[PDB]
Amino acid sequence: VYTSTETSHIDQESYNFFEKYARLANIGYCVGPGTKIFKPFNCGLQCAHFPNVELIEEFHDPRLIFDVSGYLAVDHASKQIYLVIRGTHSLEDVITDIRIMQAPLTNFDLAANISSTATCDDCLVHNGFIQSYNNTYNQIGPKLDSVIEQYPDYQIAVTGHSLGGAAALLFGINLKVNGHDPLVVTLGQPIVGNAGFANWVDKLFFGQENPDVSKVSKDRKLYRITHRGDIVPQVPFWDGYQHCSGEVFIDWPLIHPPLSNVVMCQGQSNKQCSAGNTLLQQVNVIGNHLQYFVTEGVCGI
Ligand SMILES: *[C@@H]1O[C@H](CO)[C@@H](O)[C@H](O)[C@H]1NC(C)=O
Ligand SMILES: *[C@@H]1O[C@H](CO)[C@@H](O)[C@H](O)[C@H]1NC(C)=O
Ligand SMILES: [K+]
Numbered sequence: 328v329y330t331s332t333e334t335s336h337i338d339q340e341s342y343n344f345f346e347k348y349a350r351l352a353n354i355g356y357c358v359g360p361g362t363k364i365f366k367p368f369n370c371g372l373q374c375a376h377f378p379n380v381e382l383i384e385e386f387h388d389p390r391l392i393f394d395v396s397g398y399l400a401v402d403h404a405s406k407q408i409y410l411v412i413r414g415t416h417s418l419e420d421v422i423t424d425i426r427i428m429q430a431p432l433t434n435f436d437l438a439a440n441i442s443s444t445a446t447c448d449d450c451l452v453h454n455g456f457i458q459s460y461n462n463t464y465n466q467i468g469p470k471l472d473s474v475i476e477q478y479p480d481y482q483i484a485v486t487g488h489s490l491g492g493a494a495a496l497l498f499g500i501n502l503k504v505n506g507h508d509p510l511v512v513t514l515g516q517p518i519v520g521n522a523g524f525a526n527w528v529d530k531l532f533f534g535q536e537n538p539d540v541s542k543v544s545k546d547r548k549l550y551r552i553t554h555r556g557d558i559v560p561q562v563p564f565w566d567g568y569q570h571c572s573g574e575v576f577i578d579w580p581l582i583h584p585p586l587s588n589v590v591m592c593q594g595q596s597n598k599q600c601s602a603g604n605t606l607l608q609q610v611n612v613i614g615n616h617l618q619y620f621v622t623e624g625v626c627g628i
Contacts, residue, residue: 328522328569329537330602331594334576341543342586345552345575348512349620350376352488355397355413357626358385364398371627379404383474386466389415392424393458395494397487399467399474407482407510408474410498412463414490418613418624421490425517426562430454432521438497439464445504449523452497453563456519459490460497475507484510488623489559489616492516492551496528496571499549503531514552514619515559518568525595528571540572541591549573553601555580556608556615560601569595576600582618 350373357363357370364370368380380402387396397412414421432451436443439461475483483502487495492513499511511532520528526536532549533540540547551570553560554577560570574592576599577584592600608615617624 329572329595331592331597332599333541333593334590334597334599335541336587337543337589337591339586342589344543345512345550345589346620348484348486348550349514349552349623351409351411352413352486352491352514352619353621353623354626355411355487355491356624358396358398358413359387359415362626368400373621377402380409384467384470387415388462388466391458391462392416392421393455393490394462395459395466395491397463397467397491399471401474401478401481406478406480407484408471408478410463410467410471410483410485410495412459412485412487412491412494412498414459418489418616422559422562422612422616424455425490425559428455429565430563432567433457435497435500435520435524438501440468440501440505447523447527450520450527452520452524453568456490456493456497456517459494460501463494463498464501482510483507484512486512486514488514488619490517493519496551500528500531508548510548512550512552514623515554515557515616516551517559517562518564518570521567522569525569525571529595533572537594538572539593540574541593543591550575552577552619554615554618556604556611557601557618558604558609558612559616561604571595574600577619580618582620582622584620
């Protein structure tokens, strides 16, 4: 596994870009029962930061513990199509499953829209996260394709928090091997697959193994935002699992971190970042997993 302790600071434009995706991910918690996103795109404070955005479709499946909910929208101001995904089930229930239950690792080429030749032969991923990816594809994939055809020069951006972040990573990989050029930003994302998968994802997105991911740049298309004290990005840890590169770490205990305290981390594990979370920092598992620029997991704040 490529390890490092190198980190780099960011500028305010990059901080505002990460905050943006944190907000869009938060809005994913406005989909489901008891909540709503009103057309065009109204859902209280967080949707109010998105003029000229129209909700296309929401989706919600509660059938299985790894099923997903979320929405598809088009932002005519930024010329982007947004796919935003979350886990349908409570964060407590989902994280308990990921933390404690041992998935058999499955080849990503078994997932929807992935051809037998698109992945490396050793590209293995947690069977639950494949289900989250599949469940996203089966609910929204055809609608996303029709919207891509309708707005063919808009940039596709996939984002999600928690299990949504795992589904987003895989859905971005689906779009990328299938000829699109998506932006993928995940928050609080658990480790998806093994060393084969992680290194293949780094080649796919950064163009080499052990990529220099110290910079935010117009052409970079993968960011994994993590927060001090959140253990979700540290599980599952069954040896075998490892992250791809691309970590952006909020080294701050609260929402709304100072600019100095969001850093770009080198490597697939970095003790200056998530891998260095101390035992006292890890204690409050759900609360620390919500603190990503804005509070994630609750609609309307
Ligand atoms: C994913 O969904 C497709 C239907 O689009 C199905 O063919 C496939 O077997 C599913 N894969 C897994 C691992 O569930
Ligand atoms: C599925 O793959 C096809 C064939 O490459 C691609 O054209 C299409 O956009 C993909 N659809 C989704 C929703 O990923
Ligand atoms: K990963």
